[PDB]
């Protein structure tokens, strides 16, 4: 298992009159497409976003999707009519359609629909299906949608043949951007702890790509098991930020270092020592009144 292709649809229905549908498309952690509600054409976000599809091939898809968006918006507007007291506005729908690409010819396809935040329906095989725990009233809308044999065929075509084919080409086309290596840049900081005479040590790691990194607090070869990794936050330039903390007692800072391991470094692990020549000099440049 390596790259997951995701086409994300976000449709908001405020009432009978107001609606809007916006999409984003993700090949791993990189967005390839963007489709605003105001844009009548799918916009490329990378130079290799068309993949290995011809202009006529791509145009046939874009037109397919163009037609679909207006059809989907009305079909929901109609299902609210039909589902009268069981459900009503404001309505929120999410769609996740794509491929998980594995070595060789191996691929698994998916189409998942979330209603009002919860995942309730999936397209499975040749039909729409509710998933465990879905509201009972979804049975009629499914029975109604599964009546359409054209959509089923169109969808089966995409998930089974088009999506894997597309994304296989997408992978060759974007190889230079997908296989990139960006070196992280680390810097230390510190703040008081909840407890008296206790400090929290922050080790900031930023600008690395791909996502897998190792950030630990050390005291020689001794990995400080107290280290609490933060959650990967993105940067605007399609890179990553992460910070590792350690709770110490005042004076236990001397000897501690922050060790960063990453693919871009090439075995040359960043060792950042608390109180190092650089730490002192970097700290002077980042002073404020709190």
């Amino acid at each position, epitope marked *: 298992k390596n790259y997951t292709f995701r086409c994300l649809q976000m449709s908001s229905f405020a009432n009978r009159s107001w609606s809007r549908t916006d999409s984003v498309v993700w090949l791993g952690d990189l967005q390839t497409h963007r489709w605003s509600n105001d844009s009548a054409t799918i916009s490329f976000t990378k130079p290799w976003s068309q993949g290995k599809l011809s202009n006529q091939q791509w145009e046939k898809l874009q037109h397919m999707f163009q*037609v679909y968006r207006v059809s989907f918006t009305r079909d929901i507007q109609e299902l609210v*009519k039909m589902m*009268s007291p069981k459900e009503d506005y404001p309505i929120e729908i999410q769609l996740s359609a794509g491929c998980e690409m594995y070595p060789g010819n191996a691929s698994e396809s998916f189409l998942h629909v979330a209603f009002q935040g919860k995942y309730v329906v999936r397209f499975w095989g040749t039909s729409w299906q509710t998933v465990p725990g879905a509201p009972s009233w979804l049975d*009629l809308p499914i029975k*109604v*949608l599964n*009546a359409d*044999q*054209g959509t089923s065929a169109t969808v089966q075509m995409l998930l089974n043949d088009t999506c894997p084919l597309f994304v296989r080409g997408l992978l060759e086309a974007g190889k230079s951007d997908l296989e990139k290596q960006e070196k992280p840049v680390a810097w230390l900081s510190s703040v008081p702890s909840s407890a008296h005479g206790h400090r929290q040590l922050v080790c900031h790691v930023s600008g690395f790509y791909p996502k897998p990194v190792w950030v630990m607090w050390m005291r020689g070869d001794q990995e400080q098991q107290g280290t609490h990794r933060g959650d990967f936050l993105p940067n605007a330039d399609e890179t990553w930020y992460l910070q590792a903390t350690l709770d110490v007692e005042a004076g236990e800072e001397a000897g501690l270092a922050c060790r960063v391991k990453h693919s871009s470094l090439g075995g040359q692990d960043i060792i950042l020592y608390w109180g190092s020549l650089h730490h002192i000099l970097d700290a002077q440049k980042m002073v404020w009144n709190h």
Partner: T-cell receptor
Amino acid sequence: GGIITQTPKFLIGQEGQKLTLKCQQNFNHDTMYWYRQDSGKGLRLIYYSYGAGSTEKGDLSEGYDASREKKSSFSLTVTSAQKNEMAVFLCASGSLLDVREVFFGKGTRLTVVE
Amino acid sequence: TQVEQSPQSLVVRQGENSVLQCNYSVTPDNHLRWFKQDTGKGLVSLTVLVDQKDKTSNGRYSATLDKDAKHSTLHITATLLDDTATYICVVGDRGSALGRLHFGAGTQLIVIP
């Protein structure tokens, strides 16, 4: 399966008179429609319904209202009759699980008099 | 108007063939169907066309559909006098019951004995 029947066959109304026309189907169709046929024009939808208590506006929804009392019956009401107009109203019923199963009524003929 | 039938009126000698047609701009174009409306009565289905290139035939009525050319022809073989009526062409824009029908103005057919 059965029949979709409109009532009355013919209708006489005076300028401003509020006329109503009933339609009963035994097909066991959830969807019901009220259309208006004008000479040199296609059928235009006035109102439609997914079952009891549901009345959804068509395109020619102005000057009319519908009332779906039960699955079997749909009822159109002309809010006020026009000066000396002549009109045809057509009732249709449809399967909620088969878009292609549509059955039509034999039409109601309206004549407004002075 | 999105559905247009041709010609407005058609005259055919009894025992001959009748060819009435309809072109459309409705999108999506799930299915096309023809009705016969007898003078002062309701609408009666003759045929339903569903495929990209479909041909269907009910009794003496036959029909075709080129969903690419967005065109459909109605064929009345051996025109009887009982065929004197308006022929209405309808397009359904969806496969589920969430769709809406689009109706042509009709072609009035007159069969000279």
